């Protein structure tokens, strides 16, 4: 049967829980969300983050979407590339008011280390201890 | 250095998230948390908790609050009473239109088993195999 260490699924679980914090958007879990995303990035993924999330930028979720649309994320499938690198498939749903939801598909390539300590306020919500060192995402790329 | 095993650390996430998941209310996040929720617990438990949350339940949070209302939950403490019985102290903060929010303490008293296997698609997000299989909450007596 499929075996896997507890590390391992902890690993898979606290990666997949920031891409799907950081991928997704409702105005209600936005300050939840931007906090645990930002508290487990590495100063320049951190950095990244805030940067695309915080007004002013025009094109920011809060911005584009406010109160009125909201991005969704499905898991597709995780994928160790090497030791501290995980790529992540997922879909990715738009819905808007008065629109069908539009989806696309993306992979997030996670880079991680292990920090052996925490605050008790952040262990608490990350019990591995991961911190995102590098971070990207590519959205499917469509012809016609 | 305060020390703990990464089991106790996955532990005390995972019923903490569980926890916060089924004591907090938002229209937005209702399916999703619902969802969630009714995994982790075993038959009882699943169901007790459905029949609360559910329509027509005229005293859910979704019949209550609906659009209009949140519940909000922030830890306060997690002590091991005995094994596979975990007590969490949390605040619960009412936040309503027009109203000031509106805050109470609660002790949640949980029991949890670990099982073995998971599918795939709860793995993810159960890293730790755990199954509630008893769960009381009970709110903080008020005098004058």
Redesign the interface.
Known sequence: ??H?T??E??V??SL??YVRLRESY?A??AQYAYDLVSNFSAPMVRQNYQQFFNYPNPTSPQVILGKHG?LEVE?IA?NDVTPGVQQIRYKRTLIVDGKMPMASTWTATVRYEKVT?LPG?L??????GLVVTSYQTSEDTVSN
């Open positions: 049967g499929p896997m507890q590390e699924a902890v898979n679980a997949w829980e409702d209600d879990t909201r898991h995780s300590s306020r262990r608490l919500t990350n019990p591995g």
